[PDB]
Design a protein around this ligand. Structure first.
Ligand SMILES: Nc1nc2ccc(Cl)cc2s1
Length: 167
């Protein structure tokens, strides 16, 4: 049993809810929250800007030190950093950004990072301002992640479309 409430069960391991991931993280304090990161860990907008704002910019300060030491992530890659006031850990995952011309085949590689964690609170990778089709992102998630993933979908309209169209 875990603390996640109000989710619709899609599969054995994937759950979905219309929720603000920031407000969900603040309520649950999950072991892992996933950030929709870019390779520079520049948390300007979308999910990353919202998560970082909720940490009072402490996520960005930590991230800048990580990049200064290690250099940029790979598209499809990840790193584990602090979850600050939102979670124990933040798994920063880089899905491909369609609005930069990145290979959508890298979305499966991105979701494979989730398999290193038994339970996660996450957004749909490459959705929103990363430009991918969220229906596609949900299909790749279900077909790739084997650990228990609780997806927070920001748009009520999109949430209802993802559920209604789910095979
Ligand atoms: N407080 C939140 N801000 C955002 C911004 C973009 C997306 Cl895709 C989800 C969320 S939840």
């Amino acid at each position: 049993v875990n603390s996640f409430s109000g989710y619709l069960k899609l599969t054995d391991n994937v759950y979905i809810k219309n929720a603000d991931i920031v407000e969900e993280a603040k309520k649950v304090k999950p072991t892992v929250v996933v950030n929709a990161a870019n390779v520079y860990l520049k948390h300007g907008g979308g999910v990353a800007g919202a998560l970082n704002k909720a940490t009072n910019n402490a996520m960005q300060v930590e991230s800048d030190d990580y990049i200064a030491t290690n250099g940029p992530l790979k598209v499809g890659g990840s790193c584990v950093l602090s979850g600050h006031n939102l979670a124990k850990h933040c798994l920063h995952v880089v899905g491909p950004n369609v609005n930069k011309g990145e290979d959508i085949q890298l979305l499966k590689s991105a979701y494979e990072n989730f398999n290193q964690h038994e339970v996660l609170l996450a957004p749909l990778l490459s959705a929103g301002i990363f430009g991918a089709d969220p229906i596609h992102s949900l299909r790749v998630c279900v077909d790739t992640v084997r650990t228990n993933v609780y997806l927070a979908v920001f748009d009520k309209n999109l949430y209802d479309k993802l559920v209604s169209s789910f095979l």
